[PDB]
């Protein structure tokens, strides 16, 4: 059934419709602004997943690069992966607990006008497809981007407006002005401006929700009745609580635990408990018995934070873990640093590469991820040994890409323009116990100064967590504790992973992963203020190992040199089709580029490389 | 045991041998023509597959590109995938029912002379390897390509002859002149010529079969006795028929069903039936009980078509489903169209790209798929939501490649030479109920006219299906119905998916996927004539939404502009090693190419891009 | 707990430490020499693998190419794969039997100085991580590279020293001077020099082991107690021996068996035996019953070699299998050969490609594998039909890469410098019964001569195997037989696959895969001498099919031609941005490169290609 509604920006209209395209899907929708149009579908199986969790995947795909100008579908980009993840975070929290059904959300860019951004359209598209579908989902959600252009707050800024915005904030909101997801990149802006952007953004999401609710009412939606919701019965939970509460409370009030000892201790309680349940309730099911212990471990864990204002390691609500750092770890590295916060350890390196390396030989491949502004990028890895695990170490890793992008944008505003080399930061998490991406931003800041990049200011980030008590009637929050710098266990037993970074004066990045079906604006405002205190604490300790850029780049650093070649010798110098230069580059790792008729510029990664190149060229 | 036979073309000899190479394989063969030689192997496991179907995979691989001139094995091409699929279709129908054994056919191009095509050799190679092996296979098959060069029918045309042929038809034949597989691309040729090519082709396959039969007789082949053939016992089938026939007949004579309601209705009968079987035959096996219901659903379904000359949706044997179409769906698209036939929906877009984009920066990668003639290509996608399913959306999809290639060749003959841009068609199946590839050809034709490409004539395609009654003695067809424009259900319960496309005056493409062990020439001749009627019907309705190309390209279309740069400024314009031009392209999506000393040509995808480029260049 | 030791070269210090980085891993270590530093981790699960074997994977990764100069981690290279495999072979033999626990070893290049090679550091790193971990592992191992530079034996030669070394030998040693792994590439050097390198290398490994033992003692290591070691009980083995010994002895003393008949015959004994065990020991476990028969089949098999000095096919300890070969298999191939040794068959082809093809258009991709010296490479494939199996035929295959590299280096020293084309050898194993890589070297030598490459001498290789009797007290070898040219079955029931290749006068390559926890130097010296005899025997039979290079390249061979283009016509010749040349290359498979202002060089793969190019250019 064709249906359509327009939502006023008010500056620009959002056109939402459904009922013409892809009508076999459980849900489908198209969202258009200007001449950009996105279709989103939602499909969810009726048979339970072999998984003992909800398998949800979001796939946002584009058909061309560079504002829809360079066709690419005939042949995964960064943009696609990051956009998929943003949509995922905007919808995941609103599925019912126990909904273990294979569910897929796909996005099709029907048309892109190079002016109106399709990413935000797709988030809204997912919301309306789910809303109009028979899939249980506690929405609707509405989403907008907020920019700050020439001093003004602009909703859903055009691509041109974005290029001069000091803010790239995306907000997804649920009814009653609850925040479901916050994603932002900012030019080191004032907390007060950042926070006002959030409130404006939320306002607009509520308008979009109103439009969606109209659409739902016209469509006459009847949700499916899932075969089963896999939540443990109140009986098995109550009993489990009886059996394990005292041991769990003991474990969680023992401050001498570290990550590993604490986990092994709850695991011991789990094994015993889980076997005593198997007997009391022989009527199956191992997975439900497993669910029950997790529910109880979680509740005991949280009740202590709520009742005693103490955390399982003895910290205050606002205390940072101990931090230590070092720069200049290894002599040959252009810059490096080790950043340790509690049992989270990341090693960061900077490497200067040629300006040329920011571009691939193939035009269309280049267009895909584009050329990094300031010729600056950060690559993040989370290898399996960081958690004493075994894992795949090849291929596309979406989480690593997302985390890298987060730490990259945290750092991006302090990077100088017109640096003579490409700046590559590598962040590698060697030990993991919470907020590796925020440690990557910190480590990156230290290594960048070590390397002698004159960054404008140091950068640090931290994760804020959340524990709530909500009435069983409505989902309404009757009490809550914000946690500074959360342990792994506080993330998984907690309600959010609110990662925010910036300088001593402003905010550069935010990624709020919220696991409740939305939270009040007041809670996120407080989270931001609380993180601001911790950030400054991290910066003070960071500034004691290094507080300004090395006054030059290191001895071992790259060098650029200009080489004159007379026409008489060009043909021999370059070789047929430039073969000599290509061979020179492969063999010495230098990068040569012809500047004019007689002039060639040589980038060498080290003085040793240049020497070797000077000898290969000295024929 | 070394054996060899030569089959006369008669113009060119086919040399078939076995017994020297890869003698561990269940079967092996080499086939040579001129100085091109192909080895094919066949391996089939003796233990049943966990699959409840026959797992058959064909892998044809080349070692170089461009007529064997550009080595590539040191590092999946289109050619490889399409060739694999053609071989698969030529052999798959001849395995016995219930043969659930992992089976792999591999092709090795021992040598390629750039004159004689290895693809056809490989099809024959697969046939002789299977024939000489202990693997149950009801062959032999013979295969030839038929060309039409300068007015003459030529069997196995050379590569040079192919380049001037108005026909590229491949036919695989079984004994008694049965057609197993038909694949063809034609320059919009007369039905009568196309049909004569088929008869000539079949004649030649029979000669090849005679040679293969000699080889088999000399070798002394003894087929294995499979552990079991997984066909349901006549007992369980007879009973199931008793239980379900009346409900199934009711469902299949209710014309008010649509795809989904019909499937859910037979599924309800399945659940009930399948539980009543479990009781009557508690002696296992769930899969056999499943097989039995499918056999019965199939037979009931087919008996109605045969006995009453009516189809499950109420159509005549020759009736098209309702069709509707639209062009100009979205303003920013260079061209677009939506084509709907029954519950099959595909969205087609055309996008003009630079001539340069038809070539990759890497020579060897370029050689692999080569440069598309007329700089024209079509990319097809069949996303999972088209059938309300969940699926992988990344990586190589062989079916999508095959379908795209089919719709591409359907359209290729009407495309003008020397168009100023690369023409890319995208076909996306949004709703699926039969013949998405033929809808892609139709949609492509509409979108191409929308975009203002002066194609010589409109193109449409359609699928013909088949239901036969054969005696249980021999496989001989005692009666049959050809079906115009088949539903999904008529494909899977049917005997073929015969997809043919062309213009009002001729044939451009054919892909006959035949599921019986071959069918008579007469049946395919009739299928072609019947499809000709439906094609023209589709064209008449298509011509009512658009019947000629837009008289110009759209407002938003690409533009080419010439830019003069004085030697004095070249070095600054281009930058070191052309860095500026590369950056310009990545940032604006324009494509610049130097024409001479002072002249640069700029391709811009839109006027907006060109403007931006004119400003980046206006420094 | 931070710990560190330095091991003197004595020329260069090896710095080994642990306890600062990645402290969650079961084991971790860093190894440094000069300013190159490598971290290695080891993780092993405590729960048994579903596998009925030890799942061990080694992943060595670099972050840049070309001596650490070209960053690549932002995006598997040959170097990475070959290095991973070398580390794997150095540690795998030292795990306890039955240790079926998922285990992963990862290597992180913390820093690379372009002087000291990280590969050898990583091997040592793996050894110390395992040693310091709670993972059962019978080490330590020590590893060094030995070079021969300007007449002197140099341990851990620098990258500069390696470039002028006539030897690249890596040795991994265990305590009491046992050799665990030998990997070497040599410039056709004297057996006596090669053997002395091994002894020097082993000496140095013992020094490294001493350092590691200190580290272990300081750390206070307590190994885990695995849940279970999956070795069959002596009871089930003793009984199985009773049941099957006589039939197994009969099968293994029947010289009329071939590979397939022998395997089917032991399999028949297995089926019967395995069912009689199920009864005698109904107390499970199928896998243990399976293990037991394999242990017994292995022991019976080996006892015959030991007691009777006869092998299961009737051969002497030192006898080669029958060999036959052929060159010039197919007319269009630049060179080709078929090499058959017993039931091992490989087809080798040579193809001349452009010098340009040794380089990719993308600089950074080129740097990754670099440019092959002498513009020579070998690509090896082991398709599934070679063993009558079904398998994946796409994607990265680590074993194929390793084997190709082995045969490549075997041949590399005899290749002439400054050949006018890239030389590509393809080796394809068509039938497999032992030592396919050594057959690839032999086949490559024949095909190279066939193709008219003036190689300095013929090359052959062969595999030596080993059967030992060791006391049950210590692992000490009380008796042993070296086997010339081993069957598949002698490899899997044997103690090593010692693959060595070279010319009549010297050694070019070695890959010793040893499956015992190290073997005495004396045994490898004897293996080398015994292989020397067989190599020369293979060379004598090879020289009877071809004993010198064809005096010219074949008729069909590539041609280079120089084409003069006047400035007046350049713009038209090359087209915009070189489009014409690119199109010419894609369409004819020729390769054009501009030599100067008016001169273009054309490489054509065949005279036919050149003709076509001369016509495309003759416009």
mmCIF file of N, CA and C in Angstrom, chain A residues 140-199:
data_model
loop_
_atom_site.group_PDB
_atom_site.id
_atom_site.type_symbol
_atom_site.label_atom_id
_atom_site.label_comp_id
_atom_site.label_asym_id
_atom_site.label_seq_id
_atom_site.Cartn_x
_atom_site.Cartn_y
_atom_site.Cartn_z
ATOM 1 N N UNK A 140 9.172 4.315 16.873
ATOM 2 C CA UNK A 140 10.195 4.578 15.852
ATOM 3 C C UNK A 140 11.400 5.367 16.348
ATOM 4 N N UNK A 141 12.451 5.337 15.537
ATOM 5 C CA UNK A 141 13.598 6.212 15.669
ATOM 6 C C UNK A 141 13.594 7.298 14.588
ATOM 7 N N UNK A 142 14.113 8.470 14.931
ATOM 8 C CA UNK A 142 14.355 9.527 13.960
ATOM 9 C C UNK A 142 15.818 9.929 14.062
ATOM 10 N N UNK A 143 16.395 10.348 12.937
ATOM 11 C CA UNK A 143 17.802 10.743 12.913
ATOM 12 C C UNK A 143 18.110 11.985 12.074
ATOM 13 N N UNK A 144 18.995 12.836 12.581
ATOM 14 C CA UNK A 144 19.481 13.972 11.811
ATOM 15 C C UNK A 144 20.969 14.156 12.031
ATOM 16 N N UNK A 145 21.611 14.852 11.102
ATOM 17 C CA UNK A 145 22.956 15.357 11.325
ATOM 18 C C UNK A 145 22.818 16.818 11.748
ATOM 19 N N UNK A 146 23.636 17.271 12.695
ATOM 20 C CA UNK A 146 23.684 18.689 13.036
ATOM 21 C C UNK A 146 25.071 19.208 12.693
ATOM 22 N N UNK A 147 25.110 20.325 11.975
ATOM 23 C CA UNK A 147 26.345 21.011 11.664
ATOM 24 C C UNK A 147 26.408 22.371 12.344
ATOM 25 N N UNK A 148 27.605 22.942 12.407
ATOM 26 C CA UNK A 148 27.776 24.325 12.843
ATOM 27 C C UNK A 148 28.535 25.058 11.746
ATOM 28 N N UNK A 149 27.824 25.901 11.008
ATOM 29 C CA UNK A 149 28.403 26.549 9.845
ATOM 30 C C UNK A 149 28.401 28.042 10.091
ATOM 31 N N UNK A 150 29.584 28.639 10.057
ATOM 32 C CA UNK A 150 29.684 30.075 10.195
ATOM 33 C C UNK A 150 28.879 30.551 11.400
ATOM 34 N N UNK A 151 28.947 29.805 12.497
ATOM 35 C CA UNK A 151 28.303 30.216 13.732
ATOM 36 C C UNK A 151 26.874 29.740 13.928
ATOM 37 N N UNK A 152 26.294 29.071 12.932
ATOM 38 C CA UNK A 152 24.892 28.661 13.060
ATOM 39 C C UNK A 152 24.673 27.152 13.084
ATOM 40 N N UNK A 153 23.699 26.722 13.879
ATOM 41 C CA UNK A 153 23.319 25.317 13.923
ATOM 42 C C UNK A 153 22.432 24.997 12.719
ATOM 43 N N UNK A 154 22.867 24.032 11.919
ATOM 44 C CA UNK A 154 22.179 23.669 10.692
ATOM 45 C C UNK A 154 21.843 22.181 10.729
ATOM 46 N N UNK A 155 20.575 21.839 10.554
ATOM 47 C CA UNK A 155 20.199 20.429 10.519
ATOM 48 C C UNK A 155 20.349 19.866 9.100
ATOM 49 N N UNK A 156 20.819 18.624 9.011
ATOM 50 C CA UNK A 156 21.074 17.962 7.737
ATOM 51 C C UNK A 156 21.794 18.859 6.742
ATOM 52 N N UNK A 157 22.971 19.353 7.133
ATOM 53 C CA UNK A 157 23.743 20.229 6.259
ATOM 54 C C UNK A 157 24.055 19.547 4.940
ATOM 55 N N UNK A 158 24.103 20.344 3.877
ATOM 56 C CA UNK A 158 24.488 19.846 2.566
ATOM 57 C C UNK A 158 25.966 19.513 2.596
ATOM 58 N N UNK A 159 26.407 18.807 1.564
ATOM 59 C CA UNK A 159 27.787 18.367 1.480
ATOM 60 C C UNK A 159 28.715 19.581 1.475
ATOM 61 N N UNK A 160 28.280 20.634 0.791
ATOM 62 C CA UNK A 160 29.027 21.881 0.744
ATOM 63 C C UNK A 160 29.086 22.515 2.137
ATOM 64 N N UNK A 161 27.954 22.525 2.840
ATOM 65 C CA UNK A 161 27.900 23.055 4.204
ATOM 66 C C UNK A 161 28.787 22.247 5.170
ATOM 67 N N UNK A 162 28.802 20.930 4.998
ATOM 68 C CA UNK A 162 29.617 20.048 5.832
ATOM 69 C C UNK A 162 31.106 20.392 5.724
ATOM 70 N N UNK A 163 31.534 20.757 4.519
ATOM 71 C CA UNK A 163 32.937 21.041 4.259
ATOM 72 C C UNK A 163 33.413 22.278 5.012
ATOM 73 N N UNK A 164 32.483 23.141 5.410
ATOM 74 C CA UNK A 164 32.846 24.282 6.247
ATOM 75 C C UNK A 164 32.193 24.223 7.629
ATOM 76 N N UNK A 165 31.841 23.027 8.083
ATOM 77 C CA UNK A 165 31.251 22.889 9.407
ATOM 78 C C UNK A 165 32.310 22.554 10.462
ATOM 79 N N UNK A 166 32.151 23.126 11.649
ATOM 80 C CA UNK A 166 33.037 22.809 12.759
ATOM 81 C C UNK A 166 32.472 21.629 13.543
ATOM 82 N N UNK A 167 31.353 21.088 13.064
ATOM 83 C CA UNK A 167 30.689 19.977 13.723
ATOM 84 C C UNK A 167 30.040 19.013 12.729
ATOM 85 N N UNK A 168 30.314 17.724 12.922
ATOM 86 C CA UNK A 168 29.608 16.642 12.259
ATOM 87 C C UNK A 168 29.016 15.683 13.292
ATOM 88 N N UNK A 169 27.791 15.964 13.734
ATOM 89 C CA UNK A 169 27.142 15.207 14.792
ATOM 90 C C UNK A 169 25.932 14.509 14.209
ATOM 91 N N UNK A 170 25.808 13.211 14.440
ATOM 92 C CA UNK A 170 24.605 12.520 14.003
ATOM 93 C C UNK A 170 23.894 12.077 15.254
ATOM 94 N N UNK A 171 22.601 12.372 15.348
ATOM 95 C CA UNK A 171 21.843 11.880 16.485
ATOM 96 C C UNK A 171 20.613 11.076 16.093
ATOM 97 N N UNK A 172 20.466 9.929 16.747
ATOM 98 C CA UNK A 172 19.280 9.107 16.605
ATOM 99 C C UNK A 172 18.502 9.175 17.899
ATOM 100 N N UNK A 173 17.224 9.510 17.773
ATOM 101 C CA UNK A 173 16.360 9.699 18.911
ATOM 102 C C UNK A 173 15.158 8.779 18.855
ATOM 103 N N UNK A 174 14.673 8.417 20.031
ATOM 104 C CA UNK A 174 13.481 7.609 20.160
ATOM 105 C C UNK A 174 12.409 8.502 20.774
ATOM 106 N N UNK A 175 11.188 7.971 20.943
ATOM 107 C CA UNK A 175 10.101 8.801 21.474
ATOM 108 C C UNK A 175 10.414 9.341 22.866
ATOM 109 N N UNK A 176 9.704 10.396 23.253
ATOM 110 C CA UNK A 176 9.927 11.069 24.525
ATOM 111 C C UNK A 176 11.357 11.569 24.581
ATOM 112 N N UNK A 177 11.892 11.948 23.422
ATOM 113 C CA UNK A 177 13.188 12.604 23.347
ATOM 114 C C UNK A 177 14.320 11.770 23.965
ATOM 115 N N UNK A 178 14.258 10.458 23.809
ATOM 116 C CA UNK A 178 15.331 9.612 24.299
ATOM 117 C C UNK A 178 16.422 9.488 23.238
ATOM 118 N N UNK A 179 17.670 9.543 23.667
ATOM 119 C CA UNK A 179 18.797 9.406 22.756
ATOM 120 C C UNK A 179 19.207 7.951 22.617
ATOM 121 N N UNK A 180 19.212 7.467 21.377
ATOM 122 C CA UNK A 180 19.560 6.077 21.097
ATOM 123 C C UNK A 180 21.016 5.926 20.656
ATOM 124 N N UNK A 181 21.519 6.933 19.958
ATOM 125 C CA UNK A 181 22.833 6.859 19.332
ATOM 126 C C UNK A 181 23.332 8.279 19.114
ATOM 127 N N UNK A 182 24.599 8.512 19.440
ATOM 128 C CA UNK A 182 25.249 9.780 19.150
ATOM 129 C C UNK A 182 26.587 9.529 18.464
ATOM 130 N N UNK A 183 26.769 10.096 17.277
ATOM 131 C CA UNK A 183 28.046 10.007 16.582
ATOM 132 C C UNK A 183 28.470 11.411 16.179
ATOM 133 N N UNK A 184 29.668 11.828 16.572
ATOM 134 C CA UNK A 184 30.115 13.170 16.220
ATOM 135 C C UNK A 184 31.611 13.326 15.966
ATOM 136 N N UNK A 185 31.931 14.229 15.048
ATOM 137 C CA UNK A 185 33.293 14.662 14.791
ATOM 138 C C UNK A 185 33.247 16.182 14.857
ATOM 139 N N UNK A 186 34.153 16.791 15.613
ATOM 140 C CA UNK A 186 34.137 18.244 15.752
ATOM 141 C C UNK A 186 35.521 18.880 15.707
ATOM 142 N N UNK A 187 35.571 20.128 15.251
ATOM 143 C CA UNK A 187 36.817 20.879 15.227
ATOM 144 C C UNK A 187 37.178 21.446 16.617
ATOM 145 N N UNK A 188 37.307 20.562 17.604
ATOM 146 C CA UNK A 188 37.743 20.954 18.946
ATOM 147 C C UNK A 188 36.845 22.023 19.539
ATOM 148 N N UNK A 189 35.532 21.809 19.497
ATOM 149 C CA UNK A 189 34.580 22.857 19.855
ATOM 150 C C UNK A 189 34.170 22.859 21.321
ATOM 151 N N UNK A 190 33.604 23.980 21.763
ATOM 152 C CA UNK A 190 33.209 24.166 23.159
ATOM 153 C C UNK A 190 32.163 23.160 23.605
ATOM 154 N N UNK A 191 32.296 22.695 24.840
ATOM 155 C CA UNK A 191 31.362 21.723 25.386
ATOM 156 C C UNK A 191 29.942 22.239 25.255
ATOM 157 N N UNK A 192 29.776 23.527 25.539
ATOM 158 C CA UNK A 192 28.465 24.164 25.549
ATOM 159 C C UNK A 192 27.824 24.143 24.165
ATOM 160 N N UNK A 193 28.620 24.387 23.129
ATOM 161 C CA UNK A 193 28.117 24.337 21.758
ATOM 162 C C UNK A 193 27.784 22.890 21.360
ATOM 163 N N UNK A 194 28.705 21.972 21.651
ATOM 164 C CA UNK A 194 28.482 20.548 21.406
ATOM 165 C C UNK A 194 27.162 20.078 22.032
ATOM 166 N N UNK A 195 26.973 20.393 23.310
ATOM 167 C CA UNK A 195 25.758 20.021 24.042
ATOM 168 C C UNK A 195 24.477 20.662 23.492
ATOM 169 N N UNK A 196 24.576 21.899 23.023
ATOM 170 C CA UNK A 196 23.416 22.539 22.418
ATOM 171 C C UNK A 196 23.057 21.852 21.094
ATOM 172 N N UNK A 197 24.072 21.430 20.344
ATOM 173 C CA UNK A 197 23.840 20.693 19.108
ATOM 174 C C UNK A 197 23.021 19.434 19.382
ATOM 175 N N UNK A 198 23.398 18.709 20.428
ATOM 176 C CA UNK A 198 22.656 17.515 20.808
ATOM 177 C C UNK A 198 21.160 17.804 21.065
ATOM 178 N N UNK A 199 20.858 18.875 21.787
ATOM 179 C CA UNK A 199 19.469 19.193 22.113
ATOM 180 C C UNK A 199 18.659 19.590 20.885
#
